[PDB]
């Protein structure tokens, strides 16, 4: 980001990044779509039971995920900066409450500032 | 590209001093306008937190969070003692030999 103080303001506000990374929704080999109509298509392929989930992605965005490989939920098909909502939904409360603290602690670690994770954790809880 | 050959004791010439004022300004200016925004940040923080008070002795949950040292790259940025000290264990830590206390 900027980053610094504005960065800290951005993290506590859960602001969507410029070019977000998207996250897989369930385990299973990934599947491709029809063609480039507007952006592109991407078909989720769950392995065993309910397998109707789907999403749409722009072909301008490069891809990183493997094609015929199994990919669990919360994996990076696309490199980029992550968003708190996505982490919370695809990983859980503890994963996101750890991401927030670990990321907001880097800007304070850069400057000689030391604060226990407890206060950031109470803020994340709120 | 044209560095400051002189040290403060020898004395600066006009050109190098003028070059230095460039970085001097951003430093002075950054402190003044940051004063306004830091207040906004801390104010929002106090606004989102006030009513939260320590109200109970114990919750009775083993959930907690897993505390592991921040070992980034080659070495550690902060040991585990510092990220664990002052807090309470969620479950019985065993000796590295499993099944102990």
């Amino acid at each position: 980001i900027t980053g610094g103080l504005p960065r800290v303001a951005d993290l506590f506000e859960a602001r969507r990044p410029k070019e977000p990374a998207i996250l897989a929704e369930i385990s299973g080999i990934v599947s491709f779509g029809k063609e480039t109509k507007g952006k592109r298509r991407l078909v989720i392929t769950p392995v065993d039971g309910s397998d109707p989930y789907e999403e749409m992605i722009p072909k301008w965005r490069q891809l990183n995920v493997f094609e015929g490989e199994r990919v669990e939920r919360g994996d990076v098909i696309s490199d980029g900066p992550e968003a708190p909502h996505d982490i919370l939904r695809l990983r859980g409360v503890h994963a996101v409450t750890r991401y927030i603290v670990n990321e907001v602690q880097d800007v304070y670690r850069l400057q000689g500032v030391k604060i226990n994770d407890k206060h950031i954790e109470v803020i994340v809880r709120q | 590209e044209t560095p400051i050959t002189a040290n403060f004791r020898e004395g600066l010439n006009v050109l190098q001093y003028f070059i230095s004022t460039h970085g001097a300004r951003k430093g002075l200016a950054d402190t003044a306008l940051k004063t306004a925004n830091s207040g906004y940040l801390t104010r929002r923080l106090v606004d989102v937190a006030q009513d939260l008070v320590v109200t109970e002795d114990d919750c009775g949950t083993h959930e907690g969070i897993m505390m592991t040292p921040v070992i980034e790259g080659g070495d550690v940025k902060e040991p585990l003692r510092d990220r664990v000290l002052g807090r309470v264990t969620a479950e019985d830590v065993l000796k590295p030999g499993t099944a102990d206390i």
Binding site: G4, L110, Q111, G112 | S20, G23, A24, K26, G27, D30
Partner: peptide
């Protein structure tokens, strides 16, 4: 070493180089 920012040290510019 610490954003100053007048001169750089290793990764960023700094108040003291």
């Amino acid at each position: 070493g610490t954003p100053g920012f007048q001169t750089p040290d290793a990764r960023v510019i700094s108040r003291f180089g």
